[PDB]
Amino acid sequence: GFPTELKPGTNQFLTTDDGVSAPILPNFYPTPCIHIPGEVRNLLELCQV
Amino acid sequence: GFPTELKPGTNQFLTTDDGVSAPILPNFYPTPCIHIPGEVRNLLELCQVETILEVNNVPTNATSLMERLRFPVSAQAGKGELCAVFRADPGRSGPWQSTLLGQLCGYYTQWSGSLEVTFMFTGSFMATGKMLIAYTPPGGPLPKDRATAMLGTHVIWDFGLQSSVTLVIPWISNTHYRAHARDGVFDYYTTGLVSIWYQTNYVVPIGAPNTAYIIALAAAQKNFTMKLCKDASDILQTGT
Amino acid sequence: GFPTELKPGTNQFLTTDDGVSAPILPNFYPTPCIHIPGEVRNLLELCQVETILEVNNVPTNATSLMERLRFPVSAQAGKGELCAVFRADPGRSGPWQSTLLGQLCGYYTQWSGSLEVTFMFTGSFMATGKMLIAYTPPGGPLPKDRATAMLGTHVIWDFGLQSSVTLVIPWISNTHYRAHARDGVFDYYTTGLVSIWYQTNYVVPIGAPNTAYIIALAAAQKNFTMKLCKDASDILQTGT
Amino acid sequence: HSTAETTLDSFFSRAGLVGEIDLPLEGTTNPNGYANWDIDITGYAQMRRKVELFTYMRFDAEFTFVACTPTGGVVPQLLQYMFVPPGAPKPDSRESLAWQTATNPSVFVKLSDPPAQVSVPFMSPASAYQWFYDGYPTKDLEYGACPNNMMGTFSVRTVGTSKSKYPLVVRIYMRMKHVRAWIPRPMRNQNYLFKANPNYAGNSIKPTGASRTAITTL
Amino acid sequence: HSTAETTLDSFFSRAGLVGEIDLPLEGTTNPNGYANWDIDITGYAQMRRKVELFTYMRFDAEFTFVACTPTGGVVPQLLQYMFVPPGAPKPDSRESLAWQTATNPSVFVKLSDPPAQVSVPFMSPASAYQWFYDGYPTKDLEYGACPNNMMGTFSVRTVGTSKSKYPLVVRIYMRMKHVRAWIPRPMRNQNYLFKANPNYAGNSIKPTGASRTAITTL
Amino acid sequence: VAQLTIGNSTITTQEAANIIVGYGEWPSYCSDSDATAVDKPTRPDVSVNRFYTLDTKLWEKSSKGWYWKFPDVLTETGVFGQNAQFHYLYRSGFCIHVQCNASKFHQGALLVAILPEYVIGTVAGGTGTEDSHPPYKQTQPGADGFELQHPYVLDAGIPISQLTVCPHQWINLRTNNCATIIVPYINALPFDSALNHCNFGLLVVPISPLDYDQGATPVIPITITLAPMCSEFAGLR
């Protein structure tokens, strides 16, 4: 075993925090996305309409 | 000690998750594997094997199940008569359940690809005639009569000549979701429709069997897929 | 703090698992090791040492145990007579238990390799004659008589000449699993069968011992293996 | 569409429940706070039908032990799961010197601690396991039964000299990994009769799948 | 077939139970909530016979302490295991200034926490331990007894000034690692009489292994 | 017409129709590692490599199908029967050849296939309550084969509707008759017993029922001829 000390925030759930966690379906290959006309990437695009 | 904060999912057991854990027997050297002929690496290899399609899945009697393997053609039938008809539903119940393809699909939730039914005439050698096999893509109900059936993709099969013809089903996609009684399984929807018609009457000389049978062999083409696993299996293990 | 999720097996103690843990005495410098003659690095080194095979494992009396080390040959025996016979079972109970090879196997579950029994004639110098050693692979029961025994792998041993012959057992594989009363140990099954026969009667001149003994020395060949450990040991440590 | 969900490892993965030991405080079943479970991958119902798609298989397994009370409660009870390598003898009492023998890998864990998991390597002394054996392993009927296919034996028990304080239920999950299959064979189509052989109801033979009225009427 | 399972480290590895301390709340044995265990690798029955296959050995050991209640229950009791380096004096009371002396490595852990483990290096002041000593270490019979082979002493005890609240059972597991053996000697074939010497029943001498009827009848 | 002659045998079989090589592998001997490393296994090239022609079975309008078990089938008749009996270990590939003598006035179709480790299962009593492992007649049916009782489930709850997933070949009377299959040694062991464990089974079922207008010989003979490709044995008894 490699030495570790736990820092505060252990076992904590922050709604904003975004680390990760395993896929419920490992071998699942989400049907590829094709090309959909007019994608939006930043709401600010809209604010100029 | 090196600083660590634990993230949610700690101490959690996910049946699918596959990290690792120590070997119960560290120094054990599992007898090496030698070479075993015919290894399989992806079930899809199997889905391309032709297996007998029980198109004649009508006799249910116990000592007749062997008839389900083939349908018949004979003198009694006159030109135009509809011989048989089934759907392009590799998944769903029906004649496809007899095929290995079908049975595997049951172990999967959704799929898509091109299929390939083959028809083998087993009648006499002296037997001749023409049968008209026709596929009607999703929608268009089974053609009214032989005529109209021919105006769409079909193949006139002549056993006098070639004793075995193969028909290709363009594509079937069991992805169009649904929700029946409660078994909300992705229902085909894309049920093509293969119909076989008597193009000419059955012709045979004096001395030959005035009735023959046709075996059907299906299998998916190269471009077949399967997504999502479903262990639906009515045949289950029972304690002696 | 650096993000971590704990996987199952946390806080778990596996007797076999071998990671690590701090030294109770950090600054301790274990007196260096000097050179000790004859180090062993793999028990298999031992399994190739010839050790006395108690083929004559019959006398059980306390003050006779020393006889178990050798079987005899004499004038009383006539040509053809069967002298002795045992199995090629380095593991299982029997004459092999006396050998180091045997005893080690007991500390293992399964194995395979070629063996090597040696036979040493200790009779007079003036003694002469021929003994026929024969091995019968798994199956074929012990040859009916000397004759038929000879029609298979055998070696005619003549002590008048060479006073010590060695026989090689091709291969014995204690892997064919089984389940006796409850001790479902991988039973040999592959019990070869070595039989020694009197090819000629025992011949000696006036003045020499009209009976001699033969010692047996076994050991496994180079290609021997052992898999799985089993601490089966009836000889256990007892508190004074 | 990636043909990866159709591999062999993606077909046979996923931790399935194959065993469920039971240590009631008092009653009939396992009256000694311990029980011996023989690794049987058919502990999972629909598994038999699946693996039996092939004639020869090779794989390893990761077993996971989820133990609690019948209620589903967590309790401060320490357990010991032991592994009996096919070939070594199994415990017969609540302190048969069997739990003592090192060559029998044991793993102590409290119910407090998350499930315990360990990996069993491909045991068999053969090149691979084999669901079918058309013969006899050279009174009684020893047909179809293949010897060396025994993966071992897990022996669950409440650590300690005395009986446990609460009732316990140990569920055993096993996910097989790194799979290699050989010789594909037809898919079982008649209900199973015994865990032993492939016997089937000799009269109750039903058609592979549902049937219809006439061959012309869809 | 890999000849790796026949090495020395693969023969002598595996954590074996060598000690079992007992701290009953009230009774006879260890009436002071503490006890002194002398590291003895023969705490494991079949170990003697094994190591005794050689005349000289060298190794390290990883000790693990699995403590609980006799029932197998986990409890909020803090313990202290101390190590008495062969040469230093051992505790004699429940607060002999022995537990205080730093040169005696102690390790505090609660029963809540998973087993405690530590590694003891090859102690002996010799090049190696030696199971046999044909002489006397330059009234009484001091034969066969080899001095420097003492690995130390573990002293278990319930932390704190007062006695423990619950009964406790500390099991001590030890797996030896990095082994080197020398001078292979014949395998013991007569039951053991004392932990001391190799004496044996001087009349109850049995044959190395089972016997048969006639040498010709198999 | 062209008669192949490999041994003191001479079958007058077709010139060279289509043969299905099993699992895509020609039966061969062995590299240099087996269940015998200091035991060089003698490879019978003598009379163990000739043509064997099993007693022709008669196909009726009602035959349920037949099956044979290898290597058993031959351990009976033959010098290959001599070997399989006097030897301990065994490894051998094969090559079956099923012929059908019928007229253009008959009709039918036979599915001929090889199924490794073909484990039978009788009725299990009658309805399904008797752990009666099939007789020594169904496990090793000598050189005269044995009939299927439940062709649909191949006597082992497996659907014949899928048997083609094995090395197979069809024999549709109106199109051919002879069919060939080269089987390679398939086992989870290099060298296995040639007397107790049957490496596989050869099935031959009438999928399209035999038939003939009344007046033609009602029984069509199915002649199975086979040749042991790369026999191997170890230690005689």
Check CB contact of A1 with chain C, cutoff 8 Å: yes
The DSSP code for B232 is -
- Domains of chain B by range and CATH? 1-240 (2.60.120.20)
* Residues 198-227, chain C, touching E (beta carbon < 8 A): 225-227
Judged by 3 or more CB pairs under 8 A, whether B touches A is yes
Q: What is the DSSP-derived secondary structure letter of residue C24?
A: S
Contact D4 A27 (CB under 8 A): yes
Nearest C-alpha in D relative to C112: D125
**Continuous segment of H or E residues that includes residue B115:** strand B108-121
Strand order in the sheet with C130-136: C82-88, C192-198, C130-136, C154-158
Compute CA distances F49 → C114, F67, F83, F93, F229, whole Å.
Answer: 31, 23, 12, 11, 7
Q: For residues C79 and C145, is the Cβ–Cβ distance under 8 A? A: no
Contact E1 B27 (CB under 8 A): no
**Which residue in chain B is spatially nearest to E1 when comparing CA positions?**
B31
Closest-CA residue in chain E for C235? E191
Judge whether C189 is closer than 8 Å to chain F, CB to CB: no
Cβ atoms of residues F152 and D190 within 8 Å: no
Cβ pair F155, D200 in contact under 8 A: no
**How close is the nearest chain A Cα to the Cα of C20, in Å?**
6
Nearest to B39 among D42, D48, D181 (CB): D181
Q: In D, residues 3-62, which contact A (CB 8 Å cutoff)?
A: 4-5, 7, 10, 13
What are the Cα distances from residue E17, in Å, to D145, D163, E170? 37, 20, 11
> Cβ of E122: how many Cβ atoms within 10 Å?
21
- Return contacts of E96-105, CB within 8 angstroms, 24+ apart: E98/E155, E99/E155, E99/E157, E105/C24, E105/C25
Between chain B and chain F, the number of residue pairs with CB atoms below 8 A apart is: 110
Distance (Å, rounded) from C-alpha E81 to C-alpha E159?
9
Mapping DSSP to helix (H, G, I), strand (E, B) and coil, where does residue B122 land? coil
Would you call C12 and D64 a contact, using CB atoms and an 8 Å cutoff?
A: no
* CATH number for the domain harbouring residue E17: 2.60.120.20
Amino acid at E10: S
Q: Do D198 and F156 touch (CB under 8 A)?
A: yes
Alpha carbon distances (Å) from A29 to A15, A19, D1, D2, D5: 27, 22, 7, 6, 7
The distance in angstroms from the start CA to the end CA of chain B is 55
Q: Is A2 touching B (CB cutoff 8 A)? A: yes
Contact C38 E183 (CB under 8 A): yes
> Which residues, numbered 110 to 139 in chain C, qualify as contacts with chain F under a Cβ-Cβ cut-off of 8 Å?
114, 136-139
C5 reaches A (C-beta below 8 A):
yes
DSSP B197: E
Contact state of C1 with B3 under an 8 Å Cβ cutoff: yes
Chain D stretch 136-165, residues whose beta carbon is closer than 8 A to a beta carbon of chain B: none
Size of chain B, expressed as the number of residues it contains: 240
Phi/psi at F183 (5° precision): -100, 130
Please, which residues bridge with residue E21 across strands? E170
CB contact under 8 A, A7 and B2: no
Q: Which residue of B has its CA nearest to C229?
A: B28
> Strand C39-40 vs strand E168-184: parallel, antiparallel, or unpaired?
antiparallel
Domain that holds residue F175: 1-237
How far A10 CA sits from the closest chain D CA (Å)? 17
| F59-84 residues labelled b (16+ CB within 10 A) or e (exposed) | beeebbbbbbbbbbbbbbebebbebb
User: Of the candidates C119, C100, C117, which has an alpha carbon nearest to the alpha carbon of residue C170?
Assistant: C117
Residue with tokens 């489930």: F153
Tally of domains within chain E: 1
Q: What is the DSSP string of A1-49?
A: ---EEEPTTTT---SS-------SSTT---------SS--S-GGGGGG-
User: Mutation test of the interface with chain D: which of C4, C15, C172, C182, choosing the one with the most D Cβ atoms within 10 A?
Assistant: C15
3-class secondary structure for E151-184? CCEEEEEECCCCCCCCCEEEEEEEEEEEEEEEEE
> What CA–CA distance (Å, rounded) separates D124 from D135?
18
Residues of D in contact with F157 (CB under 8 A): 188-192, 198-200
Resolution in A: 3.9
**C-alpha span between E32 and E24 (Å, rounded):** 9
Domain carrying residue E59: 1-218
C2 touches chain B (CB under 8 A): yes
Residue of B nearest to E2 (CA): B29
Smallest Cβ distance to A5: which of B1, B8, B17?
A: B1
Question: Between chains, do D113 and C10 touch, taking CB under 8 Å as contact?
Answer: yes
Does residue E69 contact residue E169 with C-beta atoms inside 8 Å?
A: yes
Q: How far is C103 from chain E (nearest CA, A)?
A: 7
CB distance from C227 to chain B under 8 Å?
A: yes
Which other chains touch chain A, taking contact as 3+ CB pairs less than 8 Å apart? B, C, D
Partner residue opposite C177 with nearest CB, options D114, D117, D147: D147
- In 3D space, the residue among F125, F160, B59, B60 whose CA is nearest the CA of residue D200 turns out to be F125
Partners of C240 on chain E (C-beta within 8 Å) are 194-196
F37:C140 CB<8 A? no
Put simply, the chain B residues between 114 and 173 with a CB less than 8 A from any chain D CB are 142
Closest CA to C54 of C100, C121, C8: C100
List chain F residues with CB under 8 Å of B163.
172, 174-175
Q: Which residues of C touch A9 (CB under 8 A)?
A: 1
Please check whether residue F92 is in contact with residue F228, taking contact to mean a CB–CB distance below 8 angstroms. yes
Put simply, the answer to whether E114 touches D113 (Cβ < 8 Å) is yes
Least Cα distance to B46 among E135, D7, E208 occurs for D7
Residue F165 is nearest to which of D128, D133, D184, comparing CB atoms?
Answer: D184
d(CA C199, CA C80): 6
Is the distance from CB of C84 to CB of C41 less than 8 angstroms? no
Residue B26 C-alpha, separation from nearest chain E C-alpha, in angstroms: 9
F128 and D185 in contact by Cβ < 8 A?
no
DSSP letters for chain F: ---B--SS--B---SS--EEEGGG-------S-SS-SSS------STTSS-EE---EEE-TT---EEEEETHHHHSSSHHHHHHHHEEEE-----EEEEE---TTEEEEEEEEEEES------TTSSS-------TTTS--GGG-EE-S-GGGTTTT--GGGGGGSSEEEEETTT---EEEEPPP--SSSSEESSSB--EEEEEEEEEEEEESBTB-S-EEEEEEE---S--EEEE-
Backbone angles phi, psi at F24, to 5 degrees: 60, 50
The residue count for chain E: 218
Q: How far is D97 from chain A (nearest CA, A)?
A: 31
Taking 3-state DSSP, the helix, strand and coil percentages for chain C, each rounded to the nearest 5, stand at 10, 35, 55
> What experiment produced this structure?
X-ray
CATH of residue F120's domain is 2.60.120.20
The helix (run of H) or strand (run of E) holding residue E19 is: strand E16-23
Report how many domains make up chain F. 1
Alpha carbons C165 and C172: distance in angstroms, whole number: 21
Write out chain C residues lying below 8 Å of D117, CB-based: 7-9, 12
Q: How far apart are CA F140 and CA F151, in angstroms?
A: 18
Residue with tokens 């090589």: F21
As given in the structure block, the two tokens for residue D118 are 């360990």
* Cα F147 off chain centre by: 13
- Go through chain C and tell me how many residues it has: 240
- Closest chain D residue to F154, measured at CA: D186
